[PDB]
Design a protein around this ligand. Structure first.
Ligand SMILES: [Cl-]
Ligand SMILES: [Cl-]
Lengths: 82, 107, 98, 96, 97, 106, 98, 80
């Protein structure tokens, strides 16, 4: 019902990420640039994940699909069934 | 009898379970008998090393249970372990405190 | 009137968030995104709550990783503000793009 | 009568209690130690798997592992992992 | 004993070169490179398929486990096509009996 | 009589040698009869798709015989092939001519 | 006499070496280095001519790819010269050093 | 000996020129010599491990291919 959710990654949330980043000062143009890179990254992982879901004739995406996806993408996550 | 092989290797890690994972994982046709030993040995040793450093992480922090963050602080602060876990995200692990000098105020 | 000088809170804000580990994106928003993005690949999907969380951990870790690479590029150009050009440069040298 | 999902968590406890007998570990943190072992399992079982394939061998021996472990593990972590590895095979063959 | 027998792909690279550019040839190093290239993408697809099957507790790499390996390893258009040519080849072979 | 499966699939790529490399590769216990087909298919296709562009690259340099640089030129200029071969070094293939604008004079 | 202005020989030296593929390190020097570095890990080793050239074909590919990244960093600093603090930034973002 | 200096200034400059580098600080030359050595050391290490494990006293192209593939620097046109 809200077809453009990329926005829900709110400026403050991105600021905080950037803080953990160790960033002191943030150009305004960033947020959108970030939102975009986020979108790509999620898009890429979730594609591979759903591939894995679909390959197992499941209608439900599992935590393991997301790990198999993150491992392929070279982006390996510990603590969900690794 | 009923002696376990871990028991003969003097390992907590299951020399049993490992030998079976090797065969059923499609790594090779035949698995040596020394192999699921030498492996468990190394998987145990590395398990120790991480829990050794992380267990000290949890002292410093005045905590009794190890949380991920102790693992993060353990791994990232050791040069070798960090090379090894180079491409490894550690859920709920966060980042080592670091602030670049040029960003600090001069006073 | 009492106010802190530009980039003083910022620095505190760093120390705060580098000491902690909690996900910094409000969870519902993030979840909604993920499903919006899942539509693009298969209609009427469903997600294990742990899957959704396994992503957010991944994304948040990536972004925080980028901004560190990003922030060293800003600093490389004797700056302190991070700018799209910096991310662009970082992704470039990483291999995320041409 | 639920699936029956194994893990390594009981061995992590066992080794936690050897090295820090007074300390413990959260679900999340075990979850991580679990991923860690499977990760460096697969990593070694692979490089060994290759080594064999590359030398037209059908059998992964301890020799393969020792090479895998030299290849995958850094300077000092490698020297020790080989040693505890060597040590454990030696202890096992003598034992019985 | 004349020597041992190093197989290759080089005869299938030619056969395809001539189908695609009958007037064009290919240096030794370049055949070299195209060999490395078949070997590399071989493993890659076999691997992702090996794991695919593992993950879903299958003993058997079917065509499906190739197709899905390929959908995963190849970019958009190169995968659409690889899936097509490979689906084509299977349907044919099957209706040859 | 006898007929090479490759024939029965319409492929130049040796469906048989694939089926064998699969079993002796340790990718699984069991290999469907379709698998080595579909694979040889997909290896052939990408082999062609490179050679197509690399053959073109040779004609552009007035050459009958494809050298490595043709392959390099072919791959690096095809966005997709370039992606797929992202971490791959092509021997004796040098680099696409690129010179960043701000370095050019006047 | 006549002489070309600082840079215009370089730009050419670029065009030349981009359009070509000959290996740009002297073959024998490199090979001695390889055996120097190999004695470390085991003495009285032997190499197939090809195996040396396989290494030399990589080292050169790598260094070339690095300088590319290096140069984009130097340029990021509104410079034209490459300097060590450009390599090091590339290699950090690449993930070769800490 | 110390064959690292055998990677003369003009050869590094040559590589940089393929890299598309217009101007080259004098420091670079020794730095490059450092990064090169790391790279050779790392590859050669794993290469010679692959040799030793086959028990050969001769390093093959396939040793070096296998290494480069491990090291994430896959090479075409020497086998494998
Ligand atoms: Cl054995
Ligand atoms: Cl099949």
């Amino acid at each position: 019902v809200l077809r453009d959710n990329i926005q829900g990654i709110t400026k403050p949330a991105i600021r905080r990420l950037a803080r953990r980043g160790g960033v002191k000062r943030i150009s305004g143009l960033i947020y959108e640039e970030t939102r975009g890179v986020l979108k790509v990254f999620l898009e890429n992982v979730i594609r591979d994940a759903v591939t894995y879901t679909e390959h197992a004739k499941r209608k439900t995406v599992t935590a393991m699909d997301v790990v198999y996806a993150l491992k392929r993408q070279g982006r390996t996550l510990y603590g969900f069934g690794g | 009898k009923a002696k376990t092989r871990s028991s003969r290797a003097g390992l907590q890690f299951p020399v049993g379970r490992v030998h079976r994972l090797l065969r059923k994982g499609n790594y090779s046709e035949r698995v040596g008998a020394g192999a699921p030993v030498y492996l468990a040995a190394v998987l145990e040793y590395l398990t120790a090393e991480i829990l050794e450093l992380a267990g000290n992480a949890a002292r410093d922090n005045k905590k009794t249970r190890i949380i991920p963050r102790h693992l993060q602080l353990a791994i990232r602060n050791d040069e070798e372990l960090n090379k090894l876990l180079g491409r490894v995200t550690i859920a709920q692990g966060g980042v080592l405190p670091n602030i670049q000098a040029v960003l600090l105020p001069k006073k | 009137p009492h106010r802190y000088r530009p980039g003083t809170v910022a620095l505190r804000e760093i120390r705060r968030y580098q000491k902690s580990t909690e996900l910094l994106i409000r969870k519902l928003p993030f979840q909604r995104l993920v499903r919006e993005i899942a539509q693009d690949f298969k209609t009427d999907l469903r997600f294990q709550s742990s899957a959704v969380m396994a992503l957010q951990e991944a994304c948040e870790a990536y972004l925080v990783g980028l901004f560190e690479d990003t922030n060293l590029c800003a600093i490389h150009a004797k700056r302190v503000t991070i700018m799209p050009k910096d991310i662009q440069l970082a992704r470039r040298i990483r291999g995320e793009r041409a | 009568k639920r699936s029956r999902k194994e893990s390594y968590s009981i061995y992590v406890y066992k080794v936690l209690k050897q090295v820090h007998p007074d300390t413990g570990i959260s679900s999340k943190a075990m979850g991580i130690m679990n991923s860690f072992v499977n990760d460096i399992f697969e990593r070694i079982a692979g490089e060994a798997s290759r080594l064999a394939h590359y030398n037209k061998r059908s059998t992964i021996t301890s020799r393969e592992i020792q090479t895998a472990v030299r290849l995958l593990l850094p300077g000092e972590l490698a020297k020790h992992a080989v040693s505890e590895g060597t040590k454990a095979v030696t202890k096992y063959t003598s034992a019985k």
